[PDB]
Amino acid sequence: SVPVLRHPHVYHAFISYCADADTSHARTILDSVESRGFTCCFAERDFLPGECTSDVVVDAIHCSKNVILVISPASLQSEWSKFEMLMAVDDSHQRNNVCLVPVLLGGVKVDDLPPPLRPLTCIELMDDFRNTDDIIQAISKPLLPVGNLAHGFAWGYYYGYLKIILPDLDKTVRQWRRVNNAEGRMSEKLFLFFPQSCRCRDSIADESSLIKHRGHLPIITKDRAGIIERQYKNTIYSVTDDNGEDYFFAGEYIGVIHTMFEMEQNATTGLQTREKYVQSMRFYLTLKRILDTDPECSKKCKIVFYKDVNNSSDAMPRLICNEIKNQLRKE
Amino acid sequence: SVPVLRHPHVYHAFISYCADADTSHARTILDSVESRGFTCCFAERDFLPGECTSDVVVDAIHCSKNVILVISPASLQSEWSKFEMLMAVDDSHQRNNVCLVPVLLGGVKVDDLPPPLRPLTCIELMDDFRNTDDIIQAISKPLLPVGNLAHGFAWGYYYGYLKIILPDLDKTVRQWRRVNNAEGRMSEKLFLFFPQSCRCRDSIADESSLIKHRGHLPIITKDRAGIIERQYKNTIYSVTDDNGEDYFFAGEYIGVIHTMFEMEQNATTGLQTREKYVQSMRFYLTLKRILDTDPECSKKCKIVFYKDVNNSSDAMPRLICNEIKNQLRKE
Numbered sequence: 225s226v227p228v229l230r231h232p233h234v235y236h237a238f239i240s241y242c243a244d245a246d247t248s249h250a251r252t253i254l255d256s257v258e259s260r261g262f263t264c265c266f267a268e269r270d271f272l273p274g275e276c277t278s279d280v281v282v283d284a285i286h287c288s289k290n291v292i293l294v295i296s297p298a299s300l301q302s303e304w305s306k307f308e309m310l311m312a313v314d315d316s317h318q319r320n321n322v323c324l325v326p327v328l329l330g331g332v333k334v335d336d337l338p339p340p341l342r343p344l345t346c347i348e349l350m351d352d353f354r355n356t357d358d359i360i361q362a363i364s365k366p367l368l369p370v371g372n373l374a375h376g377f378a379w380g381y382y383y384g385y386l387k388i389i390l391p392d393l394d395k396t397v398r399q400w401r402r403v404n405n406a407e408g409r410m411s412e413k414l415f416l417f418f419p420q421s422c423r424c425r426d427s428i429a430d431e432s433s434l435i436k437h438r439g440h441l442p443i444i445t446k447d448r449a450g451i452i453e454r455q456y457k458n459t460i461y462s463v464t465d466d467n468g469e470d471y472f473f474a475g476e477y478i479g480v481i482h483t484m485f486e487m488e489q490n491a492t493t494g495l496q497t498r499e500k501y502v503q504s505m506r507f508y509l510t511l512k513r514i515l516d517t518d519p520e521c522s523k524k525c526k527i528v529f530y531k532d533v534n535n536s537s538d539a540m541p542r543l544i545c546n547e548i549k550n551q552l553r554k555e
Numbered sequence: 556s557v558p559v560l561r562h563p564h565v566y567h568a569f570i571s572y573c574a575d576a577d578t579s580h581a582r583t584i585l586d587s588v589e590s591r592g593f594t595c596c597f598a599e600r601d602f603l604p605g606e607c608t609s610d611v612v613v614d615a616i617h618c619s620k621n622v623i624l625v626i627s628p629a630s631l632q633s634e635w636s637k638f639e640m641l642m643a644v645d646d647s648h649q650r651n652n653v654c655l656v657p658v659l660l661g662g663v664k665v666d667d668l669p670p671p672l673r674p675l676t677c678i679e680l681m682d683d684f685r686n687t688d689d690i691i692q693a694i695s696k697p698l699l700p701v702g703n704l705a706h707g708f709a710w711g712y713y714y715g716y717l718k719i720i721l722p723d724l725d726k727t728v729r730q731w732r733r734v735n736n737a738e739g740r741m742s743e744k745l746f747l748f749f750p751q752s753c754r755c756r757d758s759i760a761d762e763s764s765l766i767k768h769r770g771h772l773p774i775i776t777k778d779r780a781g782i783i784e785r786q787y788k789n790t791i792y793s794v795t796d797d798n799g800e801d802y803f804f805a806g807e808y809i810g811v812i813h814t815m816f817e818m819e820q821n822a823t824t825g826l827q828t829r830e831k832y833v834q835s836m837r838f839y840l841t842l843k844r845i846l847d848t849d850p851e852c853s854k855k856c857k858i859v860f861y862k863d864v865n866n867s868s869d870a871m872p873r874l875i876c877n878e879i880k881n882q883l884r885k886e
C-alpha cells in the first residue's frame with residue numbers, strides 16, 4: 225500500500241547514490257518506485273545544481289521515511305562510499321534495519337561492503353532491474369532506537385569537563401584543606417562516583433545522613449560555547465567515620481551516565497536495563513582508555529564503581545571512607 | 556615473539572568465553588597460548604568464585620592488551636552473547652580489529668554472528684584445535700581509536716541540558732524582552748548555532764564587532780550529579796542590522812560538538828577532517844530525530860547549521876539577522 229507520512233517525512237524514500245557511476249541506475253529505481261504512488265527524493269531533479277551540499281542531503285534524509293542506498297562496484301571506490309553514503313547509516317542497528325534499504329548492483333559480495341553495511345540485510349538487484357518490486361516492499365511499512373553512547377559520553381566528558389577542572393586541581397584541593405585545617409582527614413584527589421545503575425543523586429548527602437555538604441572549591445568561570453561566565457564548581461562533602469571523626473573529600477558523580485538511567489526509565493526509549501549495563505561498561509572502558517593517554521589528568525582523579533542495589537544507609541558512607549583510606553595512605 | 560606490556564596491560568590476552576558450554580574449550584586455548592610465553596587471564600583460575608561480577612570482567616579487559624573471544628553455536632544462545640560478550644566489543648572498528656580476536660568453534664557461519672561481530676575478521680578453529688597457532692599471531696603485535704559520537708552527544712545534550720532549560724523558556728525570554736523593551740527587535744526562540752567545522756567560539760561577540768554581549772537570562776540553579784548549585788545560564792546578545800538598528804536574541808553554540816573539533820586538531824586522535832564531517836551529520840540527524848519526539852522542546856529552540864570557512868566579518872551578523880526575521884515574521 226501507500227503508507228501515510230509522519231510530520232517530518234515529506235518523501236517516502238531518499239535515493240542515496242554515487243552520482244559518478246550510478247546516477248543513471250538511481251534514476252531507473254526512481255521511476256520503478258514512483259510509478260506505484262510513492263514520493264521519492266532524487267538528487268538530479270529535486271536539488272538545485274549548486275545546492276547539493278552535505279547539509280542539504282542531510283535535510284532530505286531527515287525529511288524522508290526510508291533511504292534507498294544504491295551500492296555498486298564502482299561506487300565503493302569513489303569518496304562517496306567513505307563520506308556521503310555513511311551519512312545515511314545510523315549507528316543504531318535497529319533504525320538501520322528499518323530505515324536503510326541497501327540495493328546491490330553487479331557485484332553483490334557482502335564481504336566487500338564496509339563494516340557499517342556488512343551486517344545489514346540487503347536486496348540483490350539483477351543487472352536487468354527485475355527485483356525492483358522488492359525495493360517497494362521495504363518502503364511500505366509505516367520505540368526510539370538507541371545507538372551506542374559510550375564514545376560520545378567518554379570523549380565529551382574528557383574534553384568538555386575533565387580537561388577543564390583537573391589541570392592544577394591538586395593545588396586547589398590542597399589549598400582548601402590547608403585553609404580549613406583538614407590535614408590527615410582529607411585527600412587531594414577528586415572522587416568520581418560511578419553507580420552500577422547509573423542513577424546519579426542530586427547531592428551525595430542524599431545517600432546518608434552521614435554525608436554533609438561542607439562547601440565547594442573556587443569557582444572556575446569560563447566563556448564556553450557562547451555562554452559567557454559559565455561556572456564549573458566542585459563541591460566538598462564530609463563523611464563521618466565509625467569513630468565519630470569527619471573525613472573530608474571532593475566528590476561528585478559522573479553525571480553524563482545519568483542519561484542512561486533516564487532512557488531506561490523512559491518506556492518509549494529503546495534502552496532496557498540489560499543494554500544499559502552493557503553501554504555503561506563500554507563507557508567505563510573507553511573513558512579509562514582515554515585517561516591512560518593523559519597521565520596528568522588521570523592520576524588527579526579516582527573513578528569509583530560500585531553497586532547501589534542495596535538500601536543500606538551505611539554502605540555508601542563506609543565506601544567513601546574506605547576510598548579515602550587508600551588516598552591518605554598513599555600520602 | 557613475546558610483546559612487552561603497556562602500563563595498564565598486565566595480561567597478554569583476556570579469554571572471553573561462555574562458561575556454560577565453552578569453559579572447557581577456553582581452557583584448552585589457555586594452555587596453547589601460555590605454553591609459548593604469553594600471560595593470559597582465564598576466569599576459572601584467575602577470578603574468585605564470588606568475584607566474577609561484570610565490573611571485575613571489565614577490569615581484566617582494561618588490564619589486557621588483547622581479548623580472545625571464544626564463540627560457539629551453544630554460546631550464541633546463552634545470555635552471555637547478549638551481555639558479557641558485548642562488553643569486550645568496542646564501537647570503534649579500528650580498536651576492534653586490532654584488539655579483538657574472534658575464535659569460531661563448530662559452526663563458523665559469520666552470518667550467525669550478531670551485527671557487532673559480523674564485519675570482523677575471525678579465525679576458524681577446527682574441532683581438533685589445530686589452528687591454535689593462528690590465535691598466537693594476533694597477540695604478538697605490540698593513534699587513539701574513535702568510535703561513533705553522534706548518539707552519545709545527542710542523547711546527552713537532550714536529557715542533560717535541553718530538557719533542563721527549554722521547558723518554560725518562552726516565558727523567560729518574553730519576560731526579558733518586555734523588561735528591556737525589545738519588542739519588534741527580539742524573538743522568543745533560543746538559537747542553537749551549528750558551525751560546519753564544529754569550531755565553537757567562546758562568545759558570539761568573537762564573530763564580529765557587531766555582536767555585543769547584552770546580558771543573560773535568569774540563572775537556573777540545580778543540584779545535579781552531586782554538584783550543588785550548578786548554574787545553567789543563557790546569554791543574551793545583540794546584532795546590528797545594516798540600518799543601524801539593534802536586533803536582540805538569545806543565542807549559543809551547540810557546545811557538545813566542539814569536542815569533534817578538538818579531536819580533529821589533536822594529531823594523536825584518530826579523527827580526521829573527513830570523518831568529523833560524517834560524525835557531525837550523524838549527530839545532526841540523531842538530535843533532530845530526538846527533538847521530533849519532544850514537541851514541547853523542539854519548537855522552543857532553532858538549530859542553525861551554516862558554513863564558517865569564509866573570513867567575512869559580515870557573513871555571521873547578517874545570518875543572525877536573517878534568522879530572527881523568520882521568528883519575528885512568525886509572530
Ligand SMILES: Nc1nc(=O)c2ncn([C@@H]3O[C@@H]4COP(=O)(O)O[C@H]5[C@@H](O)[C@H](n6cnc7c(N)ncnc76)O[C@@H]5COP(=O)(O)O[C@@H]3[C@@H]4O)c2[nH]1
Binds near residue numbers: 381385477
Ligand atoms: N559533574 C559535572 N559538573 C559540571 O559542571 C559539568 N559540565 C559539563 N559536564 C559534563 O561533561 C561533559 C561536557 O561536555 P559539553 O560541555 O561539551 O556538552 C554539554 C553542553 O553542551 C550542554 N550543557 C550542559 N550544561 C550546560 C550549561 N550550563 N550551559 C550551556 N550548555 C550546557 O549539555 C552537554 C552535556 O552536559 P552534561 O549532561 O551535563 O554533562 C557534561 C558533558 O558530558 C559536567 N559534569
